[PDB]
Symmetry: D6
Subunit: 170 residues, 12 copies
């Protein structure tokens, strides 16, 4: 029912709505302020940037569900950072797992990447637990890495390798 597709210009109002939402951006450690012009101009600037892939998640009705991105793609080290957002209106519906899996499938069976990592707030243990269930393993506990909502917070860095993903049921 859910599909990942490349981000398009017609999706920018949806992204704009998410990029200005303080609750949502706190999951990405980003400042929740971005005019449509800043957004669109940065989109235009990165059209041909091969170090990133930005996806939009749609359901059968073509409703915009969320965002999935692979960024800082390095083609010597074969690594990238994965990040995801599910719009407020669609959270708690169980979609996260399916989407994490789609992103790993893209990273490992299409982009031929070796390693995917992410960052998650230590204070968000249920997100940590979900990522662990999806195969990610903690490789770091970054101390006071990000200033979020009035104080410095710690985050976990978690990763998964291509060989582990491609072969786990073998």
């Amino acid at each position: 029912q859910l599909t990942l597709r490349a981000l398009e210009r017609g999706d920018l109002r949806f992204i704009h709505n998410l990029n200005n939402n303080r609750n949502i951006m706190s999951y990405w450690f980003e400042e929740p302020y971005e005019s449509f012009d800043e957004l669109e101009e940065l989109y235009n600037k990165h059209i041909h940037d091969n170090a990133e892939r930005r996806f939009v998640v749609e359901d059968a009705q073509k409703n915009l569900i969320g965002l999935v991105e692979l960024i800082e793609i390095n083609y010597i080290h074969r690594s990238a950072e994965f990040q995801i957002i599910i719009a407020p209106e669609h959270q708690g519906k169980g979609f996260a797992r399916t989407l994490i899996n789609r992103a790993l499938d893209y990273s490992f069976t299409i982009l031929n990447l070796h390693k995917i990592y992410l960052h998650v707030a230590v204070e968000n243990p249920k997100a940590v637990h979900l990522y662990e269930e999806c195969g990610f393993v903690e490789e770091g506990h970054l101390v006071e890495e990000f200033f979020i909502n009035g104080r410095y917070q710690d985050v976990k860095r978690m990763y998964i390798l291509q060989s582990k993903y491609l072969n786990r049921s073998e």
Copy 2:
């Protein structure tokens, strides 16, 4: 009330800004000349899209009525300071929104941008405003003599400041 919200300034809000920027009574509070063509306004908006040294906000109520403006300018990333300025449109002055909005600006400055100090300038001839700022935590650090030419004469302004530690400590 608490159904007031701060959000990033957008191009669709420029007619509202143009109307405030050409109002002699409103612009005197910012020590600015009340003349700005829409083209100057807009071209300056375009120029500063990616300028990280400022954050411009519009204030709306629950019905999406534009209430006023809030700006954090001269943001300095070594000294961690910025100047705060605010305008409440004529039709909304005196309703009790000022303190809420000052508090939202401080919240943004101190819990999101992680700044150390916020300062403002206010006419000595507006002692009710000086008073309100004091009750909101600001303290006079300067009485600038004949700093600005406004409505036919040189006027004095108070410079007032509040620190992050004071704001977050209660």
Copy 3:
């Protein structure tokens, strides 16, 4: 009262264009009465950010465009500017000139903080001269054969008023 001075905007350019191509009106400003809309618009674009001028349009209560007021050659050091005004032909004789000259001086002296405002007026327009004298302007020059207008060289008066005089 209900006459208002406001910044010139792009939507007012058709009205400016009509005045700029009117020979009778441009004669008061010593200017050639020919200007395509493209020339007008392109110059307007060129000067959006030019701090040396302020162009205003005058509107009444019904938003009808009344005329035009401009402060040009604004000088940063000497604190002087030239003033010029046009009242659309249909709105003349209604006594608006005096109110508008006064608004321009108020803007110059209470907002831009200028020291001196001067203007040029044809010697052959003694009613305008008399009107400027009533508003506080004084002759400081009689410029001989300064401009070629309708076939001959003509004289103009230069007149001025200072901030100290106006603010009292």
Copy 4:
């Protein structure tokens, strides 16, 4: 009833029609071929060119009657070339004289020019005669100056001075 006004972008379809008419352009010794793009691009290029003035002739109904141009305006020598066209549909109505006079009035009472000259085909003696009646005097008979409709033709160069025009009835 007739008026001269500056040429405008909205008049270009009318001009285009004249610039592609072989009968009409033969009076200006011009090739009757010009795409709308060439026309418009040259118009854009000369917007600020002070060496020319191009006028359109309208009647009370705002119908486009003809064209009048002053070109090669030289501000040391104080001279310019005058040329005129009356659309086919409006020829023989007696308008030519009034328009020649308006052009001289513009040249001599507005632009302060000293001399206006023109060129007319020797084989167009009725045009020569009209110009003479309007005060122009022959100062040259240019031999095989222009190739027109299959052969080289001679043209008269005719002129009038500012002093003669301004003072003739004095």
Copy 5:
């Protein structure tokens, strides 16, 4: 018939040209590849707006139906020569317009542009066309061997010419 007219190519005629330019049967007469996107067509039209070395015409009948094309290219202003090429759209071939249109091109070339020589190339394998050109005054000056690759093989073309003096002398 004589109600056919030649006029400058305009942007609004480009869909008609695109249709001829992508027709294998039509483009073989000009020894050109029958592939041209509308964007290539149009961008090349834009590039050559001010190119004085060519004149492109469209042919219309009294009802404004587009009949074909006539081009004078490689116009050389020292040697006074140009190449003539023509296309009559499929639906209008065989109606007797060809001779009229050839004559109009020659008229333009010789009575307006004042050229000395017009030449063309025509497939040796189209002897009826060679014949028609001869009756219109053209004379063979070359038989170019395996000059063009067309429909799978190298073909020969005749080069034919006519001079201004011959055309204007009767």
Copy 6:
């Protein structure tokens, strides 16, 4: 017959976009199935005048977009080009592939005057290989672990046909 090959146009880009983001279809061309419309359009603009390629779309009698045919890496000296084709999923199995491969060869050999046309096809797609052999192509290479596709390196056949063979 009523299938036609014609130059790719701007109005056909939504159809190309749909194929370019389809994983199943791009797998046949060894290409990543991700391309925003802006990237597609901007590249199209970039290559308008690039003589080294010819991109065609295939249409039926009703103007329905059938697929895509491309001749790329056209070389000026060696007179070679790579051929590639896609038939939209709904139009496959209708036997159009053979007609279209033939149109592409006709264009390459009777119009562009090329000497050699080659293509790449997955070794794991022996029906496509068989189809190319029937149209006159012959294997000249078996490229080992040439492309990473759906999680592993795969082999492809390189196949070619010459102008002399086709024109007889």
Copy 7:
């Protein structure tokens, strides 16, 4: 005689720069005495083709740079221009001013075909005023508190001469 007026050139800009940063000299032109060489040079580049001005340098017999003469705000319709001159401090008092003012008028009236030349001179410089009167200029204005100079507003005379008067 052996004083010559010629077009300002790039190689003369160091000499102009020295005058432009001299407070005593720029006081005669009512101008701020601060101008980096880059500002000077960039403005010079900007105005290469500006027909509204003519800038000349004055040289003696030995090619020594004597001063500067300029005709500015040249108007196409009214046939007027403002004249201004500077004589380097070491070359003043040698009686060159009169010869040079005359060369400037000759250029204005016998070459540019202008109708009127005007200038501004400080009221507090009555020797310059007297010198201009001797060369045919006449006062047409006494401009009140026109320029801020060395700490206070000062008055200047506007003076003019016409082509008809000079050519007789």
Copy 8:
């Protein structure tokens, strides 16, 4: 013996030396890091910027002594910020006073400014005292305004008016 002159391109190596000196830049609350390219490119960018005047101080030998700048020149309010530096090699020679006076003379008798202000570290009381002796008066004590050498410091804002300066001995 000392002279103020406009900053020139040939003075930039001297300025570069000062802009990278930690002791010197601490007096201006600036970060002591600036490549020659950043310096020169910013110089090029501000050549025509009328909101500043930058002077170099030379002695009779044309040795580079120091820097004096008037910045943030506002032409409605008629104010500017004054700042000065004396190269390490020339400090304690008594030059400061003469230069402060030259800068005020420029500001008040040439630029026609109404007010000149400055900032000085509270922890630099001997500089404060010098400025007071030269006529400046404290109008502010800015609390933790600048992060300097490991901590936030307070600075005095001090000013002098045109009327006081022009008339003091009258």
Copy 9:
């Protein structure tokens, strides 16, 4: 003599041109203002590098001494006409080079550019020059009244012409 040669103007010849262009006595013969900075000269040279409507020549003797200039301007490729203008430097006037150089210009115009008509303008007040042009084949076709303002008054000029057929026929 016949060891004089005409060649294309080059950048290395610009100091020589600048010297003629700033000479009042030399420029009066071309009815041009004698003021041109080297930068205007050179930038105009740069602008017209590819301008096919003119041909500028310098004249040298056997020792490479620069003798003067010859220009063919306003070259029109339909009408086949151009204006000829010449300058012989002061030190070389009166030596008998003028006729040779006029003849070389005509040769270039008629045997190389294939023009039909060459014309020039010459001051009525220089009858010796008018005479020389007549002996070189030119014939008066116009006496332009008060055409140019030169040295304080409006002057008349003769317009003279010669045709290709006349020049090549002997």
Copy 10:
């Protein structure tokens, strides 16, 4: 020793950087590919002149010998963090400069830029370096698994950090 100094990278230092950047043994410490043409180096230097997110330093001794490099990168002005990286040229390794230089970088970061956190990455296979960083105050916060491909295999790195409060507190 303490006669080592840190200063901004300049264009004249680029040959020195090019030599380090093309050294396989040196670049392995930064997990970077050891290939960079001088033109790539320089054009990237030009591009980042005004990039406030980095500070690049060269290290010199008293005689002006270039010792190595120190960089503070990914400077984030909300989170107050940056990555520290260092290179000591081959000829100077093992002399005891490393600790001094680490201390200078920390001093710059914490007493000038006012940052909150400095982190680095170091090869797990270089335990002597890990040890030295620990003695300089850094603490491991991550052990990144197969993070970088270096010399034929995927290697692990430690991520280590130090906070401003810890550094300034003694």
Copy 11:
């Protein structure tokens, strides 16, 4: 002893000398006028133009002997125009034949062209004869194709095919 090599920027003074020589350019039907700037600017413009190859001929001493060009290279028709020049100082030394052969060898064994053609003045029968001896055959006699030295002249078009060249001694 002779070699063909690509034209280089250092060869342009040699080419300039030839392009301004009337005797030499008459062999190419070109106007003998070209400033160094026009030459160099056109060279810069065509650096990447694949439709031409321009060669310079050098001997063992690296003396510049002549020019050989292949132009209008068409890659569908596989044809090009060949043209050659031997400097005056090196004519009549027998080099022409060797160079014609080198050019054919390049065209047929390197560029893989099908046909090479040229143009030669009918009035230059010894050049015609040389080309015939080198294998070229007349395919056209173009009537009054070029205006050269005062009149229209005829030229031969001559060609040779790849198959004939590659196989003649087989």
Copy 12:
């Protein structure tokens, strides 16, 4: 040992130019031997930041330029690149080819982390083919009439080696 591979620099372009215009040398790369220095330099400028290639020059102990090694068409997903090499004519036969091919593979496999390196070699150059086989390359294609060289179409071998094989 003392042969070294390093990034191509601007100062090495005269040496590249000499090889690029040598017919005998460019024949090994199937390239037209004509390239002005301006074309070479302008392309070099164009590709400064192109991540899809790495061009190296080979130097000996005395800094003498030995030859050239290039890795081109580097692909980000498939982890493949084409390898090509030239040894200056005076330095051939000294046995340097083997050492250099090995350096290129080391760079490709231990630094760029590529999976596959392939090359093309003329079938009519069996000594080069034998040399590549000795260095671990294996034929995966015999491309028929792929390139037009010295007057006729010629065949080339495509050969490859994988990272797993080289790293063992």
